[PDB]
RNA sequence: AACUAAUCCUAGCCCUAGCCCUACACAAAUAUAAUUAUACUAUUAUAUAAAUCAAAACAUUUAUCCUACUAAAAGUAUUGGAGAAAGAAAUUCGUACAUCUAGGAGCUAUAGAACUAGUACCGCAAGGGAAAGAUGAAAGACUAAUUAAAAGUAAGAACAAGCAAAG
RNA sequence: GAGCUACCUAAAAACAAUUUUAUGAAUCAACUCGUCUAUGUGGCAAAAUAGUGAGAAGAUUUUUAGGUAGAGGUGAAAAGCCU
RNA sequence: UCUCCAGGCAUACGCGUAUAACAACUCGGAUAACCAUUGUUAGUUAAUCAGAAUAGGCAAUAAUCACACUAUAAAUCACCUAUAACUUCUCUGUUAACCCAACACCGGAAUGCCUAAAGGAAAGAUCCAAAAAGAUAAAAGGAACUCGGCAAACAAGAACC
């Protein structure tokens, strides 16, 4: 593993800091996540 | 074991058993290699402190750790803890030693009290000694009780212990004669029967 | 679902098989199904008398061990035939036919213990 | 009697037994062979009871006392048989200038392997005996292939380990 | 993701270390000395590929060619079973024609 | 001494329907590995007269105790008649 | 003797001695109820019942009687931190019986023979 | 042990002094006392003037007193490294071990009476001082939530105490350090515990009956 | 105000360079149902590699596989259902770092060897074949800490109406 | 790879009672098989259970060891069986 | 002690300490108790039970209670002549609730003796629902059921393509 990404923890933080005002697993799932703020915006 | 690492507790006691079982994996302890030639510090050697909380203080050896480049001082380097402890009681508070590597302590001059590095190089007879790098002089090697605790000169024989005198005796005559041999007509069994052909192979 | 890994012994397997354990056999199974022990089969002890006899397990602290000089054929010549022959030498009554004043043995065969090859246990 | 197979009673119960030092080499070496017979019996009649001490402490679930005679009787037994052996083995070399009491052989196996093959006694000559016929000392041309593949398998790991040796090497000078 | 939670050690490089210092002295051997050496006869490297650059299956066919006699039989069917999967993939697959 | 599991058998020398169905004498031979003088190599010499005992008690009971369970006599119908037999 | 080849015998043969003895023995307390006269011992797997007979009058000048023997499987059940079994030895178990009506009987080896009205403050000190 | 344990304190006090009872009051005699017992006790001074020269019973008590303020003072900060050096591991536990989890507010008002050494002792070789202080002091300790357990916030208490030094003669670093406190029977008992207790009586199975 | 967890750095590995080797490392046991101290009963590799596959099928044919110095001559001469493809030599050049055991714009526990191990386990057998570890100078200092931090839960079930959000 | 299964070779074993023209006969156990139904359907079971049924001195059943091997073997042919 | 159930004990093959005691109460038993689990210590004892010299010559006549008989498929070293040897007990198996089925599997598993003298327990506690499964009983009727008397029956008989 020569090169290995090590910023996807911002990367996720990204997307679920706009989601975390949604109820169920919307808010926090990133595959979830993502959909729903693709959505909302 | 290329895991076993080396501690205060002497291999193979019980305390030691417990600190290195079969299935422990840490991390190996790096050491600068020391040659037989090389290592100069003996149990019972006074040596100083270079540094530390007991910098500049001089102690006695009374435990080496080759394996780990340790030499442990009475009374120096010490923490504190409790020994003995049990349910019902805490126990006895004790001052415990931690070991110190052999660059943070120097052997000390014996007619001045110095910490003097030393280098080793033969005498007359031949045999080995330690000498000063400076004011040249002929640190002895140290005398230190047995480990396990027998004072020769003290020691007394009870039974099933031979004499002195005894052990020392010469009874071999030197022939050209196996043990056999030699006990057969010593104890005078005779045997005129011999083995027939046998073919090894 | 056989166990590969477990010494095969004379305790497994069917009646029929039977091995040894790694006694040394002290006789002979003759026609007639009959086990016939031979005496000289049969190993005997050969055991000293220890009367008046001075050492013991252990030997005193105090006791000095001495310089580890294993034996060698060439301390053991010196020891034993160097003599002989020097003082021969000297008297001119030395030859190479006759090794076996000294001690020399020819051959090993007809001694009851030969040295090579070994035919006595220790 | 079976009273040998035990310490003196006054022995029994107690937490320790004082004992001496195990003989060395250089010691036994002084005595004769007579001797040498002699004390092997009187180091056996120890190492049994010692033996049988050792085995009773563990049924009683108690501290053997001691323990440290055991070993120094069977170093001490070690030594007389390393004395008797060496005076052995001086003796055949005079007379024979074998270097083993054994004889052998230097022998291909099947697996194409050198290995040292240690001779048995017989009462029939080798060509004779059916059983010992069946052994092959041999090996078939099959066997190349596997021959050149352990050469290579065994230099792989000389190679790791003279390569880790460096390594390692690296690691002490960048500490030190 | 998790993360160190932790900062690893510094990372301490001697710029001036003698490697580092002469580094690129006598790559004008030639020129500078009359051409008796070309400069490629200074690169340290696989008997192969010194001095010279390929695709990776004229590397594996030029490692044949020059070692393949004194490889391990492991090796030279792992190296053999290479070139024939590059033999195919270049010479049959791809978008270009 | 071994355990084993096989018929049980009470006889007297004849099955019952033979009139002789009592017992004058018996005759034992040692067998030759319990003889005198290999018993005296093994060291159990108090055991020669011991091994002549033992084969008169063991055969002497089994005849016995087989020919008063010819008359009907068992462990819960005790023996009315004491029955006697001699071995040499 | 162990660990050691024997002379191969053939008609006519000498005495096979073994001067140096390899066999080493310890007495053990019988595990269930024995006679008075049995004594039990553990021996080397390559023991017979007719070396233990010379073995004990000739070392230690006791007379027997008969021996008896069996070898004793160990378990292979016990596994280690890897799951390896570990196997206990297998052993030889000896049983001889005293001669001349003496008797024995496994000797005793290891005969043997704060104030609750002021808590939680430290006592030490004197106000 | 390979190693023989070391040990720069003895656990207890060679003789126990015991005090005159009546003792507490007047805040000579017990001057005269130590030479009294000159024999018992000044032989003691004498090998202790062998391995230091320099003891003087007339300026012990001193600095035996300098000691005993600041080793109290350690435990309001609690700096356990500096008390380790102010006494011995005999009396550490005895000091600390229920102080655990607690803070304690002690300080020394001007003492009554001049400090006097009273009796000594030696045993490789231990010397011990017994010193007799008579002072008034505050102390005041509290739970893990700050609430007061024990003692009053501030006032001063006399208190008359026996306190026994040591120092271990033979090492070159050794020193004196306070070791141990002689109780007398004579003494007042000590101010109790604000809390009220209930100490539990005896518990029965269903077999059992009380007594 | 935290559970489940998370963080870690070295065990070793990879590729080259250099270099033939000569290690073949107690006693005893083993080719008998191996590891069973002795006779019974004799002991011994293989004739050409094939196919898959490519030729958009397939049927002659299909580089490496099936090795004899680099670079050039040259993808040339030649060979080929003259298709797919295959493919020289003559003849020129080359003293290779040399010295001693070195080097890494290689991996760092799902990586790098399958490997802590050809073990555990699976298979009658040939054979297949894992997983994981982390205190400190000292444990002869009671085994270390560090982190709103994953999903999952708990702290704290819910309250007409609806892709669950957006205004 | 024939420790399952197919067939074979060698050495062995089991078959009560009741009738009979005296037997690849009859009735019916042990034993072998597996007709029909229900249950079960990640089951007790990767084919079983519970009943009901077929043969049961024979071309019977069963045990131990050996044999035949995939371009093959075996097959009272179901293209069935060969872990 | 009581209530009830009715394949048990040996050997072979196989298995390999699951045997027994103590101590533990993490893991294992699909839950407890208790241990089949963990640790330690012990164990299975044999001259009768079981396993493990050579060269020649030579044979018509089953078994079945072997007699009478009948049968057909045609069916088990010895003895003799010579030669050689001229007193021996070592070695190995022996425990168990156990083996093949991934399991403490309603399955598979050979022989001898016996059929309860041996060996065992269908219900953790409570409740008395529906549906589902199994057993028994049925007023009047008696195949009107159903593709079909499938299944069940106080029946288990007859006959034909
Ligand atoms: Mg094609
Ligand atoms: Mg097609
Ligand atoms: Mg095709
Ligand atoms: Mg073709
Ligand atoms: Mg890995
Ligand atoms: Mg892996
Ligand atoms: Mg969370
Ligand atoms: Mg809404
Ligand atoms: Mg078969
Ligand atoms: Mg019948
Ligand atoms: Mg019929
Ligand atoms: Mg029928
Ligand atoms: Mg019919
Ligand atoms: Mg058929
Ligand atoms: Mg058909
Ligand atoms: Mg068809
Ligand atoms: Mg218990
Ligand atoms: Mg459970
Ligand atoms: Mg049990
Ligand atoms: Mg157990
Ligand atoms: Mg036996
Ligand atoms: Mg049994
Ligand atoms: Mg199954
Ligand atoms: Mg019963
Ligand atoms: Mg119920
Ligand atoms: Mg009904
Ligand atoms: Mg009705
Ligand atoms: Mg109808
Ligand atoms: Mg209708
Ligand atoms: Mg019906």
Redesign the interface.
Known sequence: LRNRLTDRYWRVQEVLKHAQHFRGRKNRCYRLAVRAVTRAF | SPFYRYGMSRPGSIADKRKNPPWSRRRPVVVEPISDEDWHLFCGDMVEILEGKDAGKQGKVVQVVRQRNWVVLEGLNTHYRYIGRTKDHRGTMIASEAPLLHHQVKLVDPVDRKPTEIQWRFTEAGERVRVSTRSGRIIPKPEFPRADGIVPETWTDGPKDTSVEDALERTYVPRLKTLEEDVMEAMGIQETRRFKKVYWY | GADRMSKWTSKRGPRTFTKSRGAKKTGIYTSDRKFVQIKEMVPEFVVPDLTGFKLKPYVNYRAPAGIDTPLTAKALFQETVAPAIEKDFKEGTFDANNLEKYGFEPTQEGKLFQLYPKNFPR | ??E???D?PKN??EEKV??????????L????????????????????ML???????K??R?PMPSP?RLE??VD?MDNV?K??Q???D???????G?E????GAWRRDIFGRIVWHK????????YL?KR?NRRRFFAMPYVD?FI??RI?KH??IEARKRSLQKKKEK??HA?? | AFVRLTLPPPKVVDRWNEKRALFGVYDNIGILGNFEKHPKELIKGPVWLRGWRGNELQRCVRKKKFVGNRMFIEDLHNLNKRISYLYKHFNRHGKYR | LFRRQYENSIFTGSKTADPCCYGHTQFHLIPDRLKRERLIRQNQAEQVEAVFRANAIASLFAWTGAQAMYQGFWSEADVTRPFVSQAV | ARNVLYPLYQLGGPQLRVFRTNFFIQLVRPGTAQPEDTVQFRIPMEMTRVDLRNYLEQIYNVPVAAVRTRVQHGSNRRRDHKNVRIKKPDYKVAYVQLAHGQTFTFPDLFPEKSDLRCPGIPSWFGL | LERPIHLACTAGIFDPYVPPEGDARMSLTQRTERLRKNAASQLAIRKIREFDANFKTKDFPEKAKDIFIEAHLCLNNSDHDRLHTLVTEHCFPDMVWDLKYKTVRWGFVESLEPAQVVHVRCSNMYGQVTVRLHTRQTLAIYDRFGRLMYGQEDVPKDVLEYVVFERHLMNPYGSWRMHAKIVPAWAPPKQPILKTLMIPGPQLKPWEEYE
């Not at chain 4, 004082?18 to 010691?27: E, I, V």
């Not at chain 4, 033996?51 to 402490?57: D, N």
């Not at chain 4, 001086?90 to 024979?96: G, K, P, V």
């Open positions: 009697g079976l040998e197979f035990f003196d029994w119960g004082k004992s001496g030092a195990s003989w060395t080499c250089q010691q070496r002084n005595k004769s062979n007579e001797d040498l017979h002699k004390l092997w019996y009187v180091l056996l009649k120890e190492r049994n033996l049988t001490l050792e085995q009773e402490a049924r009683q108690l440290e120094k009787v001490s048989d004395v008797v060496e005076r052995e001086a003796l055949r070399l005079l007379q024979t074998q083993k009491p054994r004889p001779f048995k006694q017989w009462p029939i000559p080798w005996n010992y292939r050149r593949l290579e230099a792989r690691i002490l500490k030190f």
